[PDB]
Design a protein around this ligand. Structure first.
Ligand code: HEM
Length: 153
């Protein structure tokens, strides 16, 4: 929904995530949890984390971080042709995890925050702008799958 150009800035920055997915994945969930604490309530498994040093030590938070950026990297690589990889995610988060679309915006922002903190040198005006559109698209598609499953928020 981006230009080929934009898809290439997105894949280019995504390669840096791929050189360390668990580490980017843990900072994302931590950024998300310190930023919108209400998001931590959706995670039965992590509700016990009382502070960042506890979040930081959690081996399962870290694996979950891996799992989450791994699924987001398989969607991104599809450059927009992702219905098949999206669907499953829209189903689980929609019916089993009960995740509002609002929270998707929160994790989109955590994800940008983390690239900006980790790769300033390579996360310039252009890469920022392509990555935002790509997350915005992922969100709008997730929003629409929801709507069609008869969900909404
Ligand atoms: C970047 C967008 C996201 C992606 C790619 C993603 C991906 C995943 C994946 C791959 C799993 C494991 C399998 C499954 O249930 O489908 C999962 C589980 C889960 N997701 Fe996400 N997710 C995203 C955003 C969110 C957000 C924003 C929340 C809550 C605010 C959330 C809450 C959960 C929960 C509570 C689980 C179950 C974890 C467990 O206790 O084992 N997800 N997600």
């Amino acid at each position: 929904g981006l230009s080929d150009g934009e898809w290439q800035l997105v894949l280019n920055v995504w390669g840096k995530v791929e050189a360390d997915v668990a580490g980017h994945g843990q900072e994302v969930l931590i950024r998300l949890f310190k930023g919108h604490p209400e998001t931590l309530e959706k995670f039965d498994k992590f509700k016990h984390l009382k502070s960042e040093d506890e979040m930081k030590a959690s081996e399962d938070l870290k694996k979950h971080g891996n799992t989450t950026l791994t699924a987001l990297g398989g969607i991104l690589k599809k450059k927009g042709h992702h219905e098949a990889e999206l669907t499953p995610l829209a189903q689980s988060h929609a019916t089993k995890h009960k995740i509002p679309v609002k929270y998707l915006e929160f994790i989109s922002e955590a994800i940008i925050q983390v690239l900006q903190s980790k790769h300033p040198g390579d996360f310039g005006a252009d890469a920022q702008g392509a990555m935002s559109k790509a997350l915005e698209l992922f969100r709008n598609d997730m929003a629409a799958k929801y709507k069609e499953l008869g969900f909404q928020g």
